[PDB]
C-alpha cells in the first residue's frame, strides 16, 4: 500500500529557505515510470502545481516559481525534497507531495499510458506559515453594536495560530460565529468572534480568549454601549 | 500558459441530486485530465483519471467524460460526503495546471444577511489603531460583496475578510470584514459605511455610524 508524508518547519521567516521532505513507502523511485510531485494550497484558495521528479531523475518545475525551486530525490531513503528559496508571505500554504503512476506493463513492456494521467495517492499535507514575527499574545477589544442583536470580541495582533474563543465560559454556543483568522500584512493574525442574541436579552456576555503559545488568557465582558 | 476554467465556481444541491461539473481547457489536452474531491481539512482524493477511467475504490456514482477541451464530472445521486470542493487537473502539458475548483454545498432557501457595523473601541484608539468591523450574519448563497465607504469615499487595500464554513444545521454562512485605519486617519473622517450586496437583498443595504457622535 502506498503512503506519503510531508515534513519540515511549520514556521519560516521571509527571505529564508524552506526545505520540505516527502517520506514515502509502497513504491520505489527506482521503479519504471514513477513520479513524485509537489502541490500547494494557500488558505481558502485553489491547488497550485509546483514540481515533479521521475525515476530517471528528470525534473520539471512551475515557470512561475522555477528560479526559487529545487527538487531532488534520495532513492535509498525513499524521500523527495523540495527546496524553496527567498520565501515571502504569499508562500504561506499547505504543501502536499503526491505519487504519479507509471504506465501499466505486461511482462515489463508498457501497454497502457492511461494510469499516468493523475496524481493517485496524496500525503496529508504540511501547513507552512511565513511571517517575520515572534510569539505574541492578542489584544482583545469589544464589539458593541449601539431583529436580533449582535456583539463580539476582536482578538487582534497575535502569533502564531491557534487561539480558542468561547462565550460565557462555554455556556453560550447558540448563535456563536468564530471566524477563521486572517494573516495581516504585519505578519500577525486577527479574528473576530461574534454572537447574535434576542434584543431583549437579562444576560451578561463575556468572551473567553486563550492563546496557548504566549500564555495569554483574557476574559472580556462585552455589554451594550453607554455605561 | 494553459488555463483550466471550471464551471460553475459554486454549486448548490441536495442529497440524491444529479450534479455535473465542467472543466474547459484553453488548448487541447487529449484525455490527460483527472478529477479530485477535497473534503475540508483533508487532501484531494483521486476520483477519475485519464478523463473517464474510474479509480479503484472510488464509488460507482462518479463518472467523467469528454476529451480535448471539454470535460465533465457527474455524480449520480449525491451522497452527504460529496459536499466538498472539486478540482480538475491537466497532465498533457508542463506545468500540470489545476482548475479553480467548484464548491458543492447544501441547498436551502435564499436568506439575506443581517448586517451590523461595529465602531472601534476607545481601548483600541488609545493604542493608535482603529479597526472597524462589519458583520453579515446567517446568509445564503455564499456570494456576498462588502464595500467600505468613508465620507462617501470608496475603500480598497485596507480591509480583510473571513467567511465561516456552512453551518451544520442552519446551512447558512457568516462573513466578517475588518477595515483598518490608523487613529489619525480615523479622526479625520466622520461617516463610516458598510455597503452589502447580496442575492437575498432587492437593493444593497448600508449600515453606518458617525464618528464621535455621542
Amino acid at each position: 500500500r502506498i503512503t506519503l508524508k510531508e515534513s519540515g518547519p511549520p514556521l519560516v521567516k521571509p527571505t529564508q529557505t524552506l526545505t520540505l521532505t516527502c517520506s514515502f513507502s509502497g513504491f520505489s523511485l527506482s521503479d519504471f515510470g514513477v513520479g513524485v510531485g509537489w502541490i500547494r494550497q494557500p488558505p481558502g484558495k485553489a491547488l497550485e502545481w509546483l514540481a515533479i521528479i521521475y525515476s530517471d531523475d528528470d525534473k520539471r518545475y512551475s515557470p512561475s516559481l522555477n528560479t526559487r525551486l529545487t527538487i531532488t530525490k534520495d532513492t535509498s531513503k525513499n524521500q523527495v525534497v523540495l527546496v524553496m528559496t527567498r520565501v515571502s508571505p504569499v508562500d504561506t500554504a499547505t504543501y502536499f507531495c503526491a505519487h504519479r503512476r507509471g504506465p501499466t506493463t505486461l511482462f515489463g513492456v508498457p501497454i497502457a499510458r492511461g494510469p499516468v494521467n493523475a496524481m493517485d495517492v496524496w500525503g496529508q499535507g504540511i501547513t507552512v506559515t511565513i511571517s517575520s514575527t515572534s510569539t505574541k499574545g492578542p489584544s482583545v477589544f469589544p464589539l458593541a453594536p449601539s431583529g436580533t442583536a449582535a456583539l463580539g470580541c476582536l482578538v487582534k495582533d497575535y502569533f502564531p495560530e491557534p487561539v480558542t474563543v468561547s462565550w460565557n465560559s462555554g455556556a453560550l454556543t447558540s448563535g456563536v460565529h468564530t471566524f477563521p483568522a486572517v494573516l495581516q500584512s504585519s505578519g500577525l493574525y486577527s479574528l473576530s468572534s461574534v454572537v447574535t442574541v434576542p434584543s431583549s436579552s437579562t444576560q451578561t456576555y463575556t468572551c473567553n480568549v486563550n492563546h496557548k503559545p504566549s500564555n495569554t488568557k483574557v476574559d472580556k465582558r462585552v455589554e451594550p454601549k453607554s455605561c | 500558459a494553459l488555463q483550466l476554467t471550471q464551471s460553475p465556481s459554486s454549486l448548490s444541491a441536495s442529497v440524491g441530486d444529479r450534479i455535473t461539473i465542467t472543466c474547459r481547457a484553453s488548448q487541447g489536452v487529449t484525455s490527460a485530465l483527472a478529477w479530485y474531491r477535497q473534503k475540508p481539512g483533508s487532501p484531494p482524493q483521486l476520483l477519475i483519471y485519464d478523463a473517464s477511467s474510474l479509480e479503484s475504490g472510488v464509488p460507482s456514482r462518479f463518472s467523467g467524460s469528454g476529451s480535448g477541451t471539454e470535460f465533465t464530472l457527474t455524480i449520480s445521486t449525491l451522497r452527504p460526503e460529496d459536499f466538498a470542493t472539486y478540482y480538475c487537473q491537466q497532465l498533457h502539458f508542463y506545468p500540470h495546471t489545476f482548475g479553480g475548483g467548484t464548491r458543492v454545498d447544501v441547498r436551502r432557501t435564499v436568506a439575506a444577511p443581517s448586517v451590523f457595523i461595529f465602531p472601534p473601541s476607545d481601548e483600541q484608539l488609545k493604542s493608535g489603531t482603529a479597526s472597524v468591523v462589519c458583520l453579515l450574519n446567517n446568509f445564503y448563497p455564499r456570494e456576498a460583496k462588502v464595500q467600505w465607504k468613508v465620507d462617501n469615499a470608496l475603500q480598497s487595500g485596507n480591509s480583510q475578510e473571513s467567511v465561516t464554513e456552512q453551518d451544520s444545521k442552519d446551512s447558512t454562512y457568516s462573513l466578517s470584514s475588518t477595515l483598518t485605519l490608523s487613529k489619525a486617519d480615523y479622526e479625520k473622517h466622520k461617516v463610516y459605511e458598510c455597503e452589502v450586496t447580496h442575492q437575498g437583498l432587492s437593493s444593497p443595504v448600508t449600515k453606518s455610524f458617525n464618528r464621535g457622535e455621542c
Binding site: 513520479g35 521521475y54 499516468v116 | 487529449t30 498533457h92 508542463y94
Partner: peptide, 7 residues
C-alpha cells in the same frame, strides 16, 4: 512543453 507521456 509536452508531458513525459504525451505523443
Amino acid at each position: 512543453e509536452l508531458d513525459x507521456w504525451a505523443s
